[PDB]
Amino acid sequence: KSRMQAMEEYIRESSDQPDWSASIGADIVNHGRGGIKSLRDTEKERRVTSFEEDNFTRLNITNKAEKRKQKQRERNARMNVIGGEDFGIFSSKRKLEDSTSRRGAKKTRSAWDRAQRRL
Amino acid sequence: RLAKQYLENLKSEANNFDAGDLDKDIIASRL
Amino acid sequence: AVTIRTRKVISNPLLARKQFVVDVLHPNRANVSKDELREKLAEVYKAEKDAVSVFGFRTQFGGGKSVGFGLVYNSVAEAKKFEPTYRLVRYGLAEKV
Amino acid sequence: PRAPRTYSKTYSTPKRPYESSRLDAELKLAGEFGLKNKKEIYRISFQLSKIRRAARDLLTRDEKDPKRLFEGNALIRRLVRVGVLSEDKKKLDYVLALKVEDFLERRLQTQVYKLGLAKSVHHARVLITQRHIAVGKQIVNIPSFMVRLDSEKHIDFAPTSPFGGARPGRVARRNAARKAE
RNA sequence: UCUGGUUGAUCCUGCCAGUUCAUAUGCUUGUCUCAGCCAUGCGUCUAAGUAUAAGCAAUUUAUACAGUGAAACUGCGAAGCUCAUUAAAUCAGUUAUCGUUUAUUUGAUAGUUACAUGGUAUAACUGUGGUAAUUCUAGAGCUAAUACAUGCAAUCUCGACCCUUUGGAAGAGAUGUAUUUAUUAGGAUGAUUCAUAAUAACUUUUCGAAUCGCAUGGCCUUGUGCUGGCGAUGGUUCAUUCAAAUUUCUGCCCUAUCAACUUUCGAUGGUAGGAUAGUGGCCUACCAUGGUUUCAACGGGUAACGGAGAGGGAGCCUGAGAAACGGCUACCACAUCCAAGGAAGGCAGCAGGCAAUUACCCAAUCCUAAUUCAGGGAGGUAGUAUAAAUAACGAUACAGGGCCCAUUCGGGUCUUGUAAUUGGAAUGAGUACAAUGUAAAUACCUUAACGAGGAACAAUUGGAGGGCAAGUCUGGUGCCAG
After folding, report:
1. Nearest nt to D162, CA vs C1'?
2. What share of chain D is helix, strand, coil (3-state, %, to 5)?
3. CATH number of the domain that C87 lies in?
4. How far apart are CA D81 and CA D91, in angstroms?
5. Sign of torsion over alpha carbons C74, C76, C78, C83
6. Compositional bias (Basic and acidic residues) at which positions (chain A)?
């Protein structure tokens, strides 16, 4: 909930550590009818494969749960993702400042608290 | 500055032993 | 040709078998039959065909590869004693009730 | 039952479909880029209008707003990666300077024509929809595919295609058999 | 909201004409992809409780039976729908049960004729019959239990002799459990009349293996003599666990145009009694007149879906747990069959329309049972707005017109037209061999062979113009006009 996508975009440039990119042809959803997977789709998918490998069996998707996880996840795509890069976060309104803001109790409140941080 | 300020917040939002690692280890000994 | 590679080979004394992830490299062809895969697995691990239980084969998009799961019991009797009834029937080790 | 689902439209009809300038514009655009109907342009115009609405929102915000630098640099990175926005013009006023024919130029059909694999945009389209064009190791049959720079580099004939090294098509081997017979 | 007229030319006010995830209706594609009425139909079996099936099979596995096993007697468990509506009285959190019951799981726990008693017993079963007739039935004759009843030469202390100094040992003594009452003593908690022990009695005085399967060891006193291994099913009490029932405090609507409410067949409290599984006006006999409230009692409204019954009320029965979607009695109605003598039902249902809810399974997640294996309409499986194609690339022949602007006259521009012939390639819908997929199967994915010139493998919808006859009509100033 605190995570908002583009801050990690800056981190990736500012991390100075590589990002484990995948192959160009491996990323089409289905023959071009579904665009390239967004970066998020490649993490949530690998959670499944990493989650499948240990349990030694697949996960079937319930007929009900199928009706809020497949389409909209790929209707956001055709509405948002163009060439596999998400554009939905841009139109959406979020309080970006609060997620970054030092709202934790360890925050500057008096002159001494900020004076400590200089030390 | 703001990028870091986000980083400590996640650290705040987010004897030393992991149950899963102990489960992976027996799987590895099983391996 | 076709290649079979096994990873995460977890040997299970309590069910007395070996479970693993089987990956199949099949250029220029449909896919491999489970009888066929069990054949090659059982020559490789030096076990009877009744003791090898493979399942769950999915071809990744674009073809040419598959990933699934495989079991190789320490004995054939153990294979009957532990395998699901249907997984025994699909090999003919058990008859449909 | 269980929760219903959100879905959205990728295009919107223009304010007035009937300006002669407008019609001549779709005529030029469909002719140059071989578009099937006006729904593709309506889609691209909708998408570009959304990007511009975001960009003007950011131009409105004062420089050094967290929101502004955030949202705009993210826009610039995405528009660069799709290849529309060149490396030397990474600033939001030039985001405000795009034009739809850039997005049509990024359509896989256009590269299949442009790289020399096809002699025409329509030839490119029939090759793509017929599974003769592969983006690296993967066969793609959608002309509306948006090609990235790294994906632009790797456009080729597919291994399974008769033009990529597979066996001659049904017509060729059929005629060869009849000639032999 | 805009656009053009109304002037010789403008401004203003008027007039005229053109300028939808709303509803119906029409054509096409849906070859791929994708998403109040109706007489309308309709339980349970392991090696382990009982076999004399006149059941089955085997033969040495049975001279008491011994495998399997119908029936019957025992044991265990049976605990979705449809209507109404209710403001912290539902529900959520939390406290207490030293105020309670609790199948099952788990840990402990009972030295106080017998080489095994009776029918005080019958089912299944054999046989005789009545009835229009039922999960309707009477007579006669059998036979069993983990069903029903009955029921059976030990140990521990004080210990002289201080004999021997571990030690033996005279003598004295002592010795279930359950209920109720009375009495005495009184490790645990903050706290107890709590726990436990003892005495005197009481009780329609409880219980303290007459059970089963597999194995046949150790001894000798050769008798089938003594002594025995692993389990199952039973049983008293306590604790634990699964739960249940009350109970402490807290918890976002408007409210006084809702100010008193209660004792209205208990309202507040005490004593005693009745009942509960137990506390308690919960109820009963007497006694006091109390209890909430302007710090909002009580009453009213509500987007408080934001608790009730199985034809209708009354009553009973089982079990650890239900006032049972089970059964029984009477009453009130509905309605069926009949030989009109009686019998039986809860369908007064369910599902539909103003019409196919089916077929395949306990595998997967789980569970009930004499339980590995049986079952579960719990559950699972199947049935019935979104991206493509209808085509792409050449060669040749034959002809000079093709297009744009302009009310007007005309002006502007150049590689064109085919309603001509012809060539080799590509592949999709279809026709489909397989494997995979799966409880099995469908579907998905992958994949042999075939598959285009009218590529007849023959998508539509709407609009604007023509032109043609020995053709037809109507009006005219011929050969015209409509």
Report:
1. E426
2. 55, 5, 40
3. 3.30.70.3370
4. 14
5. positive
6. 110-119
CB atoms within 10 A of CB D53: 11
The alpha carbon of residue A35 is apart from the nearest alpha carbon of chain C, in Å, by 14
Do C4 and C41 touch, CB atoms closer than 8 A?
yes
- The string over D33-48, giving b where at least 16 C-beta atoms fall within 10 Å of a residue's C-beta and e elsewhere, is bbbeebebbbbbbbbb
Helix axes D38-60, D20-33, angle to 10 degrees: 110
- Resolution (angstroms) equals 6.0
Angle at A44 between CA A41 and CA A50, to 5 degrees: 130
Asked if B13's CB is within 8 angstroms of A2's CB, the reply is yes
Chain E: positions less than 7 Å from a protein CB are: 20, 33, 35, 362-364, 374, 381-382, 385-394, 424-428, 434-440, 445-447, 450-452
Answer for the pair B31, C10: CB distance below 8 angstroms, yes or no. Answer: yes
Q: Indicate the DSSP class of residue A29.
A: S
> Cα dihedral sign for C36, C38, C42, C44?
positive
Q: Position of tokens 């109907």?
A: D37
How many Å from the N-terminal Cα to the C-terminal Cα in chain C?
39
- Collapsing DSSP to helix, strand or coil, C56 comes out as strand
Cα angle for residues A15, A16, A18 (degrees, 5° grid): 95
Alpha-carbon span D89 to D106, nearest angstrom: 17
> What CA–CA distance (Å, rounded) separates D88 from D91?
9
Contact assessment for residue D121 and residue D128, using Cβ atoms and an 8 Å cutoff: no
Q: Provide long-range contacts, Cβ within 8 A and 24+ apart, for D122-125.
A: D122/D34, D124/D34, D125/D34
Breaks (C–N over 2.5 Å) after residues, chain D: none
3-state class of A1 per DSSP? coil
Experimental method: cryo-EM
Most B-contacting residue of C7, C10, C11 (CB-CB within 10 A), to test interface: C10
Reading the block at residue C50, the tokens are 């009744």
> What range defines the domain where residue C49 resides?
3-97
Q: Per the structure, how many domains does chain C have?
A: 1
